[PDB]
Every structure is written in C-alpha cells, then in structure tokens.
C-alpha cells in the first residue's frame, strides 16, 4: 500500500502572534503563526505581504533587533527543535541567517512545555526545553550554526520564565514550585563564567501564580498573574492586588500595550479581555474589564487602538478598543475551522463538507463548498420570470433589462443603481418574449410567439413586422446580430435584418425543440434539436445538413460556442444531461464527452469574462470552460432559472440572475474559492451526521451550566423551536436537529442529568422503512472511574418532532456505533456487540465479542470490522453469517496514543498516532499479524477520517485540531516509485525556510524513523512553481510510464496538474 497525502485546507487556527519591524524598519508588521504557516502583514489604518511554510510546527516565534542592525530579525523554534534566525528581503525571499538543531540526547521535556525568550540587549536566546537545564544560544554575528550551552537549574519545575529589563547583566525571572510551595526567583547569567549568579531578588507567591511579565525600563521589575492575585516585584518594592473582576476565570495570555509598560492586555480562558494598568514611581495596580472577544490564545496590540485576538477555539479577530469607561468592539473576523472535532459529507454523488468546529461559546457548524461565488448588488421581487435580455436604449453600454413572464413582457430601465419599470415603444408587452436585443443597422428586435418585431432606435417605432403566412404560434426562436431563425412546430424559417426591413429567405420543412445561430458577421451554420432526439446541423440559405444522434427525453437548449480558439457545440437535455461535441467550422461534422448537472432542464447563455464563457442554469448552476479541454465548475447559488450578462453605468461587467420569485443583479468572482458558511451554536458540537430524507443534520452537542442549575448564555440547545427531554460547572448533552437549508435549530432533545452522549448515527435497520437518529450514551459519575451503564436511544424525526422509538440499556459506555448490513454494530466498553432490529421495534442482541482492549474505535467494510483503542491496538474481526458470531482475523499491539482510524480497503487500515503521525497497517497460519507498511509525520492531530469527494484511487478526507482539512488517496506502485524519486530531487532544489531537511520533517516522530509509503503531495505540487531549468534538473533521471522513457518537464507538468485537481485549490495570500 502506497498513499498520497495532500492538504485541501491549510491550518486556520492561530498559534502565536507578534509585532515589530520586520519587512522594513519603517513598516509595522503583524506576524501570525498557524502551525506550519507564517503569515506576514503590514499594519495600516492589514495588507497581506508574504506567507511561508516551515517544514515544522512553529513552537516559538519572537522578533528581536541585534545591535547595529537596521530591522528586526525573527527567531523560530520548531516542535522538532529546529532553530533558526530569519530575515525579510524585498521579488520576496525569507533568508536563513542562522540555524541548527537544539535537541539534546538526554532530557525529560518539561511539563510546562517549551519556552523561548530573548533578552532586551539581544545578547542571547534562552531556551527552556527540559527540567534541570537552561539552554543559551549566544547571538554573536559568527554563530551561524546556533551552537549553544546549558546551565544547570536547581529548580526542576519551572512554571514560567522571562528576562528582565534594566539590569547590570542579562537576568532571568521565573516562577517555580517545590514542596514548600510556589516562588519567584531571579538569576543573573554570568557571560564570562557561563553560569547562574545570585539574582537581584526573590520572593512564597500565590499558589496558582503562573504568568511572568517583564516590565520595561522606567520601573523595571516583574508582574506575576495568578488565579486571584496580580503582584508586582522589583528589588524589595512589592504590590499586590486581588480584584473580584478576575475571580471568575484564569488569565492565560497577555501583551504589552505601550513601550512604557503603563498598560497590558490580559486574556481570560473564557473570552474576557482585561486591561491591567500600572499607576505612577510605581504605586498601584488596577484591572478593568474591557469585554468579550473570541477565546484568545494570543493577543497583539497593533495601533490606533486596534488589537489582534489570535484564536484557536474560534475565529480570530480584529478588535477596536474605544467619558463612558473602557470598551472593546469587533472590527473584523477571520475564519477558523479549528478543532475540527467531527465532520460529514453532503452530496457524495457539487459536494459539500460540514464540520463540528470550535468549543464552548465558539462552537459552530462550518459548511464548505468549492465554487464560483456571486456578489449580489441588487434584488427585485418579481415572481415568474421566464427570460432575461440585456439591451441598449441609446447608441454605449446596456441600460435596459427586458424580462418576460407567461404571456407577458416587462421592460426595466437602469440609471446607475436605480431600476425603474418603463414602456419600450415598438415592443409588444402582452405576449411572452422568446428573444430580444440589439441588432444590425441601428435597430432593435422582439421575437414573441406571435410575431417578429424590427424596431428603430431614434424615435423608437415598429419599422417592420414578420408573422407566419398562416398567422401561427412560434415554438422556438434564434437570432444573432444580423439573422433570425424561427421554428413553427413542424417547419422553420430563415430571416435577415436590413434597414427598415426583415425579409425572409428560406422556407424549409422538418422530419424542433431548440435553435442556435451564434456566428463563429453572418453564421453560415445552424444548430437544431428535434421524437427523433438528435442535435442536427444545417447549412445557411441552403438548410441541407451533418448530424449526430443522442437517443434516449427531448433536448431543451442548444449552443454553438468557442473556447480558446477551439469550437464546440453544446446540447442540454430535459432530464438534466449535457452533451458537448467537437465542431467543424467549415465542414459541419461533430465528435465526442457527456456530463449530468441536475434533473431540472438546463439553459445556456454566453458571456465575456477577455474570452467567452457559458452559464448553465438548472438545479445546480454551472460555469463552463475552457487550455484546450472543457471544464465543469459549480456556482455558489441555489437554483437559478435564467441568466444574462449586464454591463451598465451602474453595474459594469455584471450579471442578472432570475429564479422563481426574484431577479438579482450581481458581479461574479473571477477565480473559484472556498465558500464557508458559519452556523454559530454558542456551545460545543461533538458529532454530526446527515439525514437526507429529513433534509436535516443531527448534531450531538454539550453546554456548560453552573450550580444553583442554569446556563451561562443562550445556546443552540436552549433556543430550539421545539424541544424535548428524557426527565461548579456541569455538562448538559443534547441532540440537535439542524435544518439543512436554513440552518435553523428545529429541535433539541436533552439527555439525562450526568448522561454523556458519545456517539451518533443515522440509518435504516432491518426491514423498517424509517431512517433513525441513534445516540450512544454513557452514565458519567465523578466517584465512578469506569463507565458501568449507558443507553442506545433510537429517535425518529417526523413532522417537527423528535420521538423516542426505543431504548437499550447496556452495562457500560457506548463509545462507537456503525450501521452494519442492516444491523447495528456497537462497541460498549471492551465488548463489540451486534444488534438486530425486530418488528416489535426493539434492538435484540445477536452476538457479542470480548477483547483485550477497550473498543474505542469501530469501522467496517463489507463483513470486516476494525476495532481500536486509545493506545493504538488494532483488531480485525469477521462477522460469520453462518455462525452468528465473530472471528478475530488479525491483531497488532504496538503501544502509541491513537486518535482516529479508517479502513482504506479489505487489506489496509489508516490511523493517526502520537506526535502528529499517520500509519498504515496491512493484512497480508501466523498471518494474523498486521504489517506496518506506511509511516508519515503529518504535523497535525487528526480527529476524524471520512470517505469523500472534493473534486490516484479512492478518497479519505481528514479533519484536524488546527482546522486543516486533508486528503489521502492510494497510488499504484508505479506512481509511488516515480513520485518518491521526484520528492528527493525536488528536495535538492527547493529552499526550505529554516534550512530544515524535508526528510527530517516527514520522518515519523515521537523514537525517530524515516517516512515510508506516503507521498507528500504538498511537496509534489510545488514542482509547478520552480523555474523551467529547475523543472528539467529534477526530471533528468525519471522513468515515465507508457507500455518506459526519460521523463520531460511537460510530462510532469501535466501529471502534477491532474494531481492538483483532486482537491480544493489554495487561495493566494498576496
């Protein structure tokens, strides 16, 4: 087994955020870490400037100015202990001044995590990585390899450490704990002796003190934040406030507002933003409650009272802080999918992904679709529109929109952004219009069912009319700049346009449901669609045929059009099908190529956006292009019946969209993009699944209430339309029923007090026509470590109500459930149990399997069952229908924290495991032993795998703690070998930011072993961005595969591009 891993959505959650002068000495920059990405903005009255990617989880990131340097440099430390110093260069390079791996062979990582600090005089970086030691990297010009030395620390449990300002030597101030309590101490770092010296001072602080803040150089000293107290120290001055306004929570992030250090910003664990003030020398401290922001991970003050709130649990923000007493207000929001805690796919057959994102007040549903978006500028309430045409009341740019309804036509004039209904003289408005628009010889044309009306421009009048010789009803019309071809049921006529007259030319007969005459001035070619169900081509004046047949529903729309400079003919079916044939401009023959778009009949229009594209209206509206092949591309809108181009003094290069009850005028995005809809829930969503017949999602969610019992704010689950029940912080679990179109919370069921809802599933069972939501619960008591009771509840959502159709009590927790061949497969504690769904409407245990491991994870394919636990033990099982029984097939105990598993195929299992790794186990007596055929250091913590389709063999998507969405797919041995060569050759060529070897990065990590059986598609795709000579460098010794030969840059360019097309494209940063 050989797999391709690629990112479909880069991590959105903010790890860290710093300001300073990096781009230029003059600029002020905001630097934001998103795991392995680093965004660089310039602050203004934010302009994105440059984004780069480490081969590394960014774990430390600080700006600092070395003596006699003109702008700040940047220190990064990665989770794998890759250090570096980086410099911005203006097109734009980030260069490596210094780098090296600061790992130690020995060393227990400290419980309080990695801590990086740079002293104020920029003498050194001080690193706290392990208990007992303090690593020091001298910042000397000539330390390009960041070689360093350690100093012994008597104190083994250090909570937090900072250098101080205004000292006669570099000085660290730190909070530590021992048996007698918690204390602050200071040490002087003797540059000469390379050792700690007795510090300026020390002091038993608050029990729960945890945050050190070094105050700048008027007052100097240190501030210590705890649970109830904020305390200041310097020499032997000492200030202590314990305000009530910080009683309620825990201060976990901070940041300095001004150089002085007069003010600090402080972030709660729960959303509160405080300001701390030092009052003046230093005489008192005061805290003020600014208000609520996203739950903050990091804060940066920018300028003009604007603040960046970096979030992990929610959206990150820009907040403006504005007598009337201090307040903060939200300016901007930045999307975070982070904690992707579970997800599911809607339209597996478009295709949209739904996630359970965020936590506590940040909890949300994210709906994610790829597609071309539309900015709407205007909406008009007009029901029943059956056609749209742009038009030009005066000889420059459209100013007239003509709309038709059933046996009716209406005209709308456009003045800037104000639309006014008028009368067009010469235009009959009692029939339904089939075509109208501008024509040759300074004229205008209306083709109704009754007649064909030529109209002049200057004083508008009906100059010429044409009707059938027998005054019959026209069935289909087609007209271009200078010609008309109208069909009348049985036979059709060709007409021209000359000044003041439209005189006939041909009068043919047919053996007709649509016409076309788009010139590729005068088009000597004609497109037709006829019980004969074919797309027929005819010569002009002549009418004498080529042909093609389509068989099967009558065709609705037909179009001749030119993409690139190649020519096509397009025919759209009344069942929703679309056929695209190649064309012959002079010859007439057609060839090739089909696609379905949506069962509602399709309508095709031309528009320009330098070249020509085609809009396709139907249940799913679609834009078409292009590069000499043609492409499907969904439009981010619910159905649009009709469209036309509109270019006005008010709406330039815009669009008019009409559906059943509304006309919309809008501009249309150039490129595709990811459209994320956010459904705030104000509580933690935990599971989601999609019930298509009920056209709604089920979402398990919990909320935090506090004791006498009441909620902290309005939630999804407290604001449902209908709600039911089963009848120090606590957890209250609910099943939400969220509508699929309007995202209304239709119903909330609330589970029993102390009942924990663990798993969810939507399915049919046995011979029952219904679809059910099915929740797995567990009874959670504080006194009781091990779950001893739980429910399986079977709910049904009919009408507006959630009914309880059945219970099953179970002597433990229901960790997992999967629907299994019409039966229900549930893992309860260390048992795996299969249930039959009877006609008495009850779940009746068929069989039962005990394991050596707690069945946390359950996944199935066919008759195979994958069973797994937190510890990374996997068991393959086989339901034996003739035995009514289970059989253990294979097994593998290899102890590592495991977070998610998925079945790839009968023989292969994917899993995410400790230190952000992926592994693959393979089935192939004592071949009940599973083999480890793939390892890869991903860099993310995967919560959820699911089979899917974004738009290589098969497709598994994953969601992640940092909010990254990924894709995994299988490769044939041939492609794996090819791409493995390529990676290695691309590694020689591509410059990596901290000069970290790709190999080191992807190496499976906890122990360290090389990556294997995985291809980093993120790396492969960058092949497209290197210089032409570098592309050829790389393909020098590669065997491509036909029937093999030395591969060329062009063979690869097209290979990698096919590869980019299997996931969503990434947005440009700038």
């Amino acid at each position: 087994s050989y797999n391709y891993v690629v990112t479909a959505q880069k991590p959105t959650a903010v790890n860290g955020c710093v300001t300073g002068h990096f781009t230029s000495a003059e600029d002020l920059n905001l630097l934001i870490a998103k795991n392995t990405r680093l965004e660089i903005y310039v602050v203004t009255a934010l302009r994105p400037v440059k984004e780069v990617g480490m081969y590394g989880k960014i774990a430390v990131m600080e700006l600092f100015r070395p003596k006699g340097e003109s702008k700040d440099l940047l220190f990064i430390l990665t989770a794998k202990y890759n250090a570096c110093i980086l410099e911005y260069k203006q097109s734009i390079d980030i260069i490596t001044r210094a780098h090296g791996n600061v790992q130690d062979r020995i060393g227990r990582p400290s419980e309080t995590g990695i801590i990086g600090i740079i002293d104020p005089e920029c003498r050194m970086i001080g690193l706290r990585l392990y208990d007992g030691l303090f690593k020091v990297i001298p910042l000397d010009r000539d330390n390009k390899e960041l070689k360093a030395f350690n100093i012994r620390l008597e104190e083994l449990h250090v909570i937090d450490v900072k250098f101080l300002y205004g000292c006669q030597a570099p000085t660290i101030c730190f909070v530590y704990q021992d048996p007698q309590g918690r204390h602050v101490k200071t040490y002087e770092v003797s540059l000469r002796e390379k050792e700690f010296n007795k510090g300026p001072w020390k002091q038993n602080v608050e029990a729960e003190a945890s945050m050190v803040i070094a105050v700048p150089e008027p007052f100097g000293g240190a501030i210590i934040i705890g649970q109830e107290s904020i305390t200041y120290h310097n020499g032997d001055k000492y200030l202590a406030i314990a305000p009530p306004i910080i009683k309620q929570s825990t201060i976990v992030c901070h940041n300095r507002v001004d150089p002085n250090g007069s003010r600090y910003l402080l972030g709660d664990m729960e959303g509160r933003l405080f300001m701390l003030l030092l009052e003046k020398t230093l005489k008192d401290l005061r805290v003020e409650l600014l208000g609520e922001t996203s739950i903050a991970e990091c804060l940066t003050y920018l300028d003009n009272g604007v603040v960046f709130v970096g979030s992990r649990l929610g959206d990150s923000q820009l907040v403006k802080l504005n007598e009337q007493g201090s307040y903060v207000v939200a300016m901007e929001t930045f999307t975070n999918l982070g904690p992707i805690v579970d997800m599911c796919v809607v339209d597996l057959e478009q295709g949209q992904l739904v996630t359970c994102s965020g936590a506590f007040k940040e909890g949300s549903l994210r709906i994610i679709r790829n597609g071309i978006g539309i900015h709407e500028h205007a909406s008009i309430d007009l029901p029943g529109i059956k056609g749209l045409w742009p038009l030009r009341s005066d000889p420059e740019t459209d100013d007239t929109l003509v709309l038709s309804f059933v046996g009716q036509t209406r005209v709308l004039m456009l003045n800037g952004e104000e639309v006014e209904e008028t009368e067009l003289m010469g235009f009959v408005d009692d029939q339904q219009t089939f075509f109208c628009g501008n024509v040759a010889h300074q004229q205008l044309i209306q083709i109704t069912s009754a007649s064909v009306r030529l109209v002049s421009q200057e004083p508008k009048a009906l100059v010429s009319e044409w009707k059938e010789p027998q005054a019959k009803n026209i069935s289909v019309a087609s007209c271009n700049s200078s010609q008309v071809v109208v069909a009348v049921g049985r036979a059709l006529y060709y007409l021209q346009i000359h000044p003041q007259e439209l005189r006939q030319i041909s009068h043919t007969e047919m053996e007709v449901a649509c016409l076309d005459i788009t010139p590729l001035g005068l088009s000597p070619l004609c497109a037709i669609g006829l019980t004969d169900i074919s797309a027929r081509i005819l010569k002009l004046p002549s009418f004498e045929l080529h042909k093609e047949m389509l068989g099967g529903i009558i065709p609705r729309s037909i179009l001749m059009t030119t993409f690139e400079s190649s020519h096509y003919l397009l025919c759209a079916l009344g069942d929703g099908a679309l056929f695209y044939f190649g064309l012959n401009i002079e010859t007439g023959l057609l060839s090739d190529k089909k696609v379905t778009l949506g069962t509602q009949p399709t309508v095709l229009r031309t528009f320009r956006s330098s070249t020509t594209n085609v809009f396709a209206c139907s249940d799913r509206p679609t834009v078409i292009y292009s590069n000499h092949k043609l492409v499907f591309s969904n439009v981010n809108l619910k159905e649009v019946n009709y469209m036309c181009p509109l270019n006005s003094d008010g709406y330039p290069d815009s669009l008019a969209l009409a559906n059943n009850s509304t006309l919309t005028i809008g501009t249309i995005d150039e490129i595709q993009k990811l459209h994320i809809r956010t459904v705030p829930l104000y509580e933690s969503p935990r599971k989601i699944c999609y019930q298509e017949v009920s056209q709604c999602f089920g979402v398990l969610s919990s909320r935090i209430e506090v004791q006498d019992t009441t909620a902290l704010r309005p939630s999804a689950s407290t604001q449902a339309l209908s709600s039911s029940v089963s009848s120090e912080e606590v957890e209250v679990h609910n099943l939400l029923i969220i509508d699929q179109h309007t995202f209304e919370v239709l119903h909330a069921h609330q589970f029993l007090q102390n009942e924990y809802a663990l798993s969810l599933v939507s399915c049919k069972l046995g011979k029952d026509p219904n679809t059910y939501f099915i929740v797995g619960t567990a009874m959670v008591y504080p006194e009781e470590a091990e779950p001893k009771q739980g429910r399986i509840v079977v709910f049904q959502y009919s009408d507006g109500k959630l009914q309880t159709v059945a219970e099953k009590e179970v002597k433990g927790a229901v960790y997992s459930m999967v629907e299994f061949n019409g039966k229900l497969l549930a893992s309860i504690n260390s048992t795996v149990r299969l249930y039959e769904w009877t006609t008495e409407k009850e779940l009746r245990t068929e069989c039962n399997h005990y394991n050596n491991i707690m069945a946390l994870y359950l996944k199935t394919k066919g008759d195979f069952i994958l069973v797994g636990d937190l510890m990374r033990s996997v068991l393959l099982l086989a339901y034996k229908p003739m035995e009514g029984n289970f059989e253990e097939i294979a097994r593998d105990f290899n102890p590592n924290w495991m977070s998610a598993v998925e079945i790839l195929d009968d023989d292969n299992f994917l899993g995410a495991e400790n230190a952000f790794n992926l592994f693959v186990c393979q089935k192939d007596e004592e071949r009940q032993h599973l083999q480890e055929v793939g390892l890869f250091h991903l860099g993310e913590f995967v919560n959820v795998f699911c089979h899917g389709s974004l738009v290589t063999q098969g497709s598994v998507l994953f969601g992640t703690v940092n909010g990254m969405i990924g894709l995994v797919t299988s490769l044939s041995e041939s492609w794996y070998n090819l791409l493995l060569d390529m990676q290695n050759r691309l590694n020689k060529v591509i410059k990596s930011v901290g000069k970290i070897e790709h190999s080191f990065w992807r190496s499976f990590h906890t122990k360290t072993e090389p990556a294997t059986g995985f291809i980093d598609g993120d790396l492969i795709e960058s092949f497209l961005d290197i210089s032409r000579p570098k592309m050829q460098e790389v393909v020098a010794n590669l065997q491509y595969d036909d029937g093999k030969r030395e591969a060329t840059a062009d063979d690869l360019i097209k290979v990698v591009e096919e590869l980019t097309r299997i996931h969503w494209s990434h947005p440009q940063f700038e």
């Binding site: 790890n15 860290g16 774990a59 990582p109 419980e111 309080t112 995590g113 449990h157 909570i159 937090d160 704990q177 048996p179 309590g181 918690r182 029990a207 729960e208 945890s210 945050m211 825990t250 976990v252 992030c253 972030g267 664990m269 903050a296 991970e297 990091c298 992990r312 649990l313 904690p339 805690v341 579970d342 936590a359 506590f360 933690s684 935990r686 924990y756 663990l758 959670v780 504080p782 470590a785 091990e786 779950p787 707690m854 946390l856 937190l870 510890m871 105990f893 102890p895 590592n896 924290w897 977070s899 998610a900 400790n914 230190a915 952000f916 913590f941 919560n943 959820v944 703690v961 906890t1006």
Partner: protein, 361 residues
C-alpha cells in the same frame, strides 16, 4: 509483630555476600546471546529479586565466569519458550566447605526479551531485547500552548475533590479532541497508580516512576504461568497498570490449580508479611524456587509432618507442608510462630504455581 525487612534479605542463605554495583544494560531491539541456567523455572519480572543455590559443576562454572563480568544470564518463560527476562547478579557467595561446592546468588530481573533461537548441558539463547515503551501524557500532543502554564498543580494534601480538580485541569484540552476527560483519565499513569495504591493499602512509600511501580505490583500479583506471560508480553507502563487493575478487581478467589474448582483463600486474606509485597521468590535447600504468597486464612488444606524452622524463609516461624484436601497436590505451607509474643501467630504461605485465580459466580 516482627521485622518485615527480614524476608527480602534472604537470611536463610547464609552470612554474607560480596556485592556488585550493577550497571550493564543492552540497548533496544538488539540481538544478544545470553547463558540460560538449567532447572531454573520461573517467569522473572524486571526489578524482582531472585535467589539461587547451585550444586552442579555445570551451573557452578556458568556463574563463576559470569561474575567476570557481564554477571547476567537469561531466565525463560516456558509455554518451550517465546519470551523471558535478563537477570543480573548483584550478590554472590561461593562456599566449598567439606569439599562440596555451593554457589548462592541473588539476581534481579532487568530486561524483557523475545526468543529467536535456543542452542545447547548449558543453554545459550539468541535473544532480541524488547524496548520499554514510554509515552508522554495523552494531552501533551493536543495541549494549547497558552495553558501550558497551568499544567503543574499545587500538590495533593496527605482530598478527593483534588482528583476531580486534577481531572478537570489536566485533561482540559480533551475538548480539542473527540473524547471526554474521564476517558483520557483511564490511561493516565498518575491516576491508575493511585487506584492501585488504594488496593495495595489494604495489604498494610513506593516508586513514583510508572515503569517501576507497574513492575513492582506485577511481581506481587498471584496469577498463573499463562497470565504472567501476558503482562511480561506487555511493553507499556500504562497497559501494565491498567491490566493490573483489572486482575485486582476481577480475581477475588484463589483455587487449587490441579483440581481447579476448589477455593484455598481470598483477596481479603492476602497481606504483605514481606516488605516487598504479598509475594516474593524464595529458594529451598535443593535449589528450587518458590514465589510464595502470604495469607492469613486458608481453607481445605491438610498438614503433614512436623512444624520446622529448618531453612525457613520467615525467621521466627516454622513451616508445615500443606496440601489440597481433595487432590493431595502440594499447595504450599502453614507457618506458625515459635514465640508467644509474635504477631501473626500463624499464616499461610502459598506457592504461586499451585494456584489458579478465579472470578467467582
């Protein structure tokens, strides 16, 4: 009472042994060839102490040379053998009085290994070292950096709200993952160790490192040769502690291994006469090793012969052979006091190979 440190110092073996500061470990996954001593049968656990008495010149050669200077031989779990444990000699006396050579040694189990091949009357085993699998906390991977500062707590008073507190603060970031605090709690070394402590307290400190703790209670647990091979197979401290909690809840009664369905004693009766635990390994005079378990009460046993202090593993007590009333199969010994001032006036010592733990009902 009596001096609880006496049984673990094996005073019945003689006066004095030259001691060796043990520092030889073989790095992980390696392939080593180690001597295997004849007629040693037991499953030895890392940290467990093993006393021996050797009479055959065969054996007496193997050790005499072992002393220089690996000092380690291999002990095998017999199913013959798939796995075992390295034992390193830390003390040794060689008596050749009356011209009869005896070698008495005290070894301690060091490393777990997988058997590859077994060649030969002294054995040498081809052996691959099994690594001790050490994992960070479940949370260290998903932990928000901002909350790092709170990961150290104020220490526990020498009181159950503290554990509710502990659970709430340590496993906070479960919310980032797809499971509850109380789950991650069931794989938390510190918690499990505590849950085990309370049971071990009913047999009344100990190691703080989970690896050690898990190996110390492993050697206390009276289970059967087939279950002992299971924990020995276990590579993780966490899975060792977990599986160990399971046995302590699930195995209340202890029966005759031979006739199977016959109750000798219960959990209630187990007590640590030895400092080390309710169970340690002891050698008899013919050099045979017995992991004997001290209990207060023991049912359905017959006593034959005369109470004797000869070579007694509990100075102060005399031993009488006890055997299963039903099958006659030798289950262990009854120990009686010789002084009328001693606490426990009697107790039963039951050999582990003779027992079968049962989950009654």
């Amino acid at each position: 009472n009596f001096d609880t440190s006496l049984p673990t110092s094996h005073t019945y073996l003689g006066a004095d042994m030259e001691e060796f500061h043990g520092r030889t470990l073989h790095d992980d996954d390696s392939c080593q060839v180690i001597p295997v001593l004849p007629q040693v049968m037991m499953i030895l656990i890392p940290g467990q102490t093993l006393p021996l008495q050797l009479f055959h010149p065969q054996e007496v050669s193997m050790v005499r040379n072992l002393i220089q200077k690996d000092r380690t031989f291999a002990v095998l779990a017999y199913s013959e053998a798939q796995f075992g444990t390295t034992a390193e000699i830390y003390a040794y006396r060689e008596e050749q009085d009356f011209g009869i050579e005896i070698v008495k040694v005290k070894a301690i189990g060091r490393q777990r290994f997988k058997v590859l091949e077994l060649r030969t009357g002294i054995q040498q085993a081809k052996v691959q070292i099994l690594p001790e699998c050490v994992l960070p906390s479940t949370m260290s991977a998903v932990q928000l950096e901002s909350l790092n500062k709170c990961q150290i707590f104020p220490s526990k008073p020498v009181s159950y709200k503290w554990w509710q507190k502990y659970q709430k603060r340590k496993f906070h970031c479960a919310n980032l993952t797809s499971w509850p605090r109380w789950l991650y709690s069931l794989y938390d070394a510190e918690t499990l160790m505590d849950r085990i402590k309370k049971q071990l307290r009913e047999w009344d400190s100990l190691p703080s490192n989970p690896i050690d703790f898990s190996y110390r209670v492993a050697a206390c647990l009276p289970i059967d040769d087939v279950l002992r091979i299971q924990l020995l197979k276990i590579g993780s401290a966490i899975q060792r502690l977990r599986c160990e909690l399971d046995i302590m809840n699930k195995c209340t009664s202890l029966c005759c291994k031979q006739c199977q369905e016959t109750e000798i004693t219960t959990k209630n009766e187990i007590f640590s006469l030895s400092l080390c635990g309710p169970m340690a390994a002891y050698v008899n005079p013919h050099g045979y090793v017995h992991e004997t378990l001290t209990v207060y009460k023991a049912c359905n046993l017959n006593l034959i012969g005369r109470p004797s202090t000869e070579h007694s593993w509990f100075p102060g007590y005399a031993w009488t052979v006890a055997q299963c009333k039903i099958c006659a199969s030798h289950i262990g010994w009854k120990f009686t006091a010789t002084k009328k001032d001693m606490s426990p006036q009697k107790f039963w010592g039951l050999t582990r190979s003779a027992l079968l733990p049962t989950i009654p009902d």
